[PDB]
Design a protein around this nucleic acid. Sequence first.
RNA 1: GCGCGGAUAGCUCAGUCGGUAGAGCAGGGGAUUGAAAAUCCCCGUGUCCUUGGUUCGAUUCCGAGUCCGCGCAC
Length: 311
Amino acid sequence: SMRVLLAPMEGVLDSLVRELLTEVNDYDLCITEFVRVVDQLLPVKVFHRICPELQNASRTPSGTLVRVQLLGQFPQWLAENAARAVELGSWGVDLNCGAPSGSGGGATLLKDPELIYQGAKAMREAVPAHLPVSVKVRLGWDSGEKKFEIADAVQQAGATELVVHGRTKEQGYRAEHIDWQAIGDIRQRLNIPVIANGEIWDWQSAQQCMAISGCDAVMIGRGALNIPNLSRVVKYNEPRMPWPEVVALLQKYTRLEKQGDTGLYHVARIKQWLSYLRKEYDEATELFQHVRVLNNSPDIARAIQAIDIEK
RNA sequence: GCGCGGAUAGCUCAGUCGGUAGAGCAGGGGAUUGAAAAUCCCCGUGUCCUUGGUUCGAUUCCGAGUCCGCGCAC
Ligand SMILES: Cc1cc2nc3c(=O)[nH]c(=O)nc-3n(C[C@H](O)[C@H](O)[C@H](O)COP(=O)(O)O)c2cc1C
Ligand SMILES: [Mg+2]
Ligand SMILES: [Mg+2]
Ligand SMILES: [Mg+2]
Ligand SMILES: [Mg+2]
Ligand SMILES: [Mg+2]
Ligand SMILES: [Mg+2]
Ligand SMILES: [Mg+2]
Ligand SMILES: [Mg+2]
Ligand SMILES: [Mn+2]
């Protein structure tokens, strides 16, 4: 039966939003924003700012497990930073092989799958054996020709599981190009679990994805902001969160403190989440207009909190 | 002169469809020391090369300019 992962989303799904979402969902796991590794062991404070859940045994307050993601190339430094992530409490570690476009990392590793093998292998070897080492890949740089070589590099590295985002790097976030079929081909070749990713917005689209890919584990990104209870919609075919409950969730958000807030976190992030929500809720367009021009946190917090959920 | 790619803190670098830039090192302060170094605590406010524009909001998108690297006009 079905696993649903919350995707890593740099600048969107930080610890606050992971707190808020996990409370009203049944996500099986969340991935952190990437920790960017070059050629040094990063200090403890970087891992704690990216993953505050490390001080709660790698769990959000409602209890959902969280896993730190690394983005980088050099095997020695991926290994040292992976070991630190798990020593700090991370429930395994994830390698990013999908980020666009320099120091090597993300999607660039997809041009030479040997680098995926070396990076992931060194990670697997530095992390205690029963903690998961996952890798998240796109299908290729500007084509899908190497997708089997990529998947095979991850498996031969000894990785626990592979998430496949069903697009090349050059295909971006374009909907017409999603290739759940290719995820399925990859799933049939590998012995390790393959988790499908891309263009899951609701129950029906998750059913289509699982039917076509053959996966019963999926990862959801953008759709998890559009519809804040998407995991339950997808798993149990519940209705999308009603608009008054979405507004209550945003109110809660405005009451969470962001560590190191340079002053405009809620201005930024309330407006950002609203731009996702208006793809789905007519009501989010009105609310976005009402807060559009508020340019400080006191003002936006006061306006969001003043909305009467009963009216 | 023409293409393509660059320009982020004193230096080396990080920076996901636009959401408010942060590590390491140097450096400054504390502890420590006879005084230092090393170690532990603290300092991360940059016209994001300059400029105009779009936008509620630009390192990011658009125009202009400069400088740098590569390969084509002397
Ligand atoms: C704003 C944004 C930030 C993202 N940041 C990351 C990231 O930090 N790491 C990563 O592996 N993928 C990242 N992704 C990719 C997503 O995890 C996911 O693979 C992609 O959005 C496709 O899934 P979706 O159609 O369900 O959104 C990001 C995507 C978006 C839109
Ligand atoms: Mg962003
Ligand atoms: Mg825009
Ligand atoms: Mg010093
Ligand atoms: Mg600053
Ligand atoms: Mg400018
Ligand atoms: Mg204006
Ligand atoms: Mg401007
Ligand atoms: Mg524009
Ligand atoms: Mn950069």
